[PDB]
Amino acid sequence: GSAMGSKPAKPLPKEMEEFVQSSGENGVVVFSLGSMVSNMTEERANVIATALAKIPQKVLWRFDGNKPDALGLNTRLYKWIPQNDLLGHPKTRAFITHGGANGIYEAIYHGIPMVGIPLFFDQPDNIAHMKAKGAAVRVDFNTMSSTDLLNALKTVINDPSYKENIMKLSRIQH
Amino acid sequence: AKPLPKEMEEFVQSSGENGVVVFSLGSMVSNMTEERANVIATALAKIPQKVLWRFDGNKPDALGLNTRLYKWIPQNDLLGHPKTRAFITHGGANGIYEAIYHGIPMVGIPLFFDQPDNIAHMKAKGAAVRVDFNTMSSTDLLNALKTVINDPSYKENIMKLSR
Predict the structure, then answer these.
(1) Which segments within chain B are labelled E, that is strand?
(2) Which of A25, A89, B22, B27 is spaced 20 to 30 A from B92 at the CA atom?
(3) Please, which residues have CB within 8 angstroms of residue A144's CB and are 6 or more apart in sequence?
(4) Looking at the DSSP assignment, which residues form a beta bridge with residue A91?
């Protein structure tokens, strides 16, 4: 019973696990665009915040800018997230991601369907293969409206075809 | 509710009282030259810790029996494991936050972007040593690892930053 402890650390930090548990039946959504667009224009952050505020899920958003004016009560901002641990949490319903390789692998591993928002580099191709397999919907960061993002979210969270398609990939992967 | 994939967990537990080291240069090091992979593998093979290396290229000839390659690692789960002794990282912000949160000292190998300044800050705080990916020899990397594992000031300094 030392100060460090001799057991593996808890999956989620203290307040974060309480926030996830408070989602009840609706569950949560993980939102991370990676380090390179954790800061963004006020206009883009409010488009996103407005969409996220309209789903009944709780939302964990990796974000470091100024708090958006339209941030919903269901949404919390985090400078960092234990992404794999959130994706493996039983409450998690969807992953909004830029489509990096580590994130897609964790999404497939844990069977979490995606809203893909590719920005740079391999990310457009990474999401294209997920969209092909029915495990993701794709939206365009620069031009998406709040309703565009909200519809993508509602689709991936509630239409089970996305969950089932990524579970097919999950069951091969492990 | 298990942080590590089964086979990865068995490897981590197999480290006994030596513990493990987590090595990840992130997404932008997809692959590297044979020459660099052998320099790294040679160094990693010479510590008593077991080593989990995020790596997706050709298996290095010099890969030690203490070292395993993974296309993907659960980085926060490994850093939170009681066996973990050090984190060799490119210096991405998320990894550094996790290392600070779990009290794990770092060998920083910054490559691009914010990574040089991220690692420079950790080194200034005594929580990291810094090496150069393109220049480092096997001895350089081995000495850095030995330092941050065996000199406790690095772990103690990063635990200060924790709170």
Answers:
(1) 20-24, 50-54, 67-70, 84-89, 106-108, 128-130
(2) A89
(3) A47, A117
(4) none
Q: What is the resolution of this structure in A?
A: 1.5
Alpha-helix residue ranges (DSSP H) falling in B45-132: 75-79, 93-102, 115-124
CB contact under 8 A, A84 and B71: no
* Residue B33 CB burial class (10 angstroms; 0-12, 13-18, ≥19): exposed
Per DSSP, what are the bridge partners of residue A96? A31, A115
B27, B82, B93 member nearest A6 (Cβ): B82
Q: B76 touching A, CB under 8 A?
A: yes
Rounded-to-integer distance, Cα B148 and Cα B56, Å: 26
How many angstroms separate the CA atoms of B49 and A5, rounded? 20
Edge-to-edge order in the sheet of strand A92-97 = A75-78, A58-62, A28-32, A92-97, A114-116, A136-138
- Residue reference for tokens 């995020």: B54
Give the chain B residue nearest A120 (alpha carbons).
B28
Tell me which residues of chain A, numbers 140 to 169, contact chain B at a CB-CB cutoff of 8 Å.
Answer: none
Task: Write down the experimental method used for this entry.
Answer: X-ray
- Residues 24-43 of chain A with CB under 8 A from chain B are 35-36
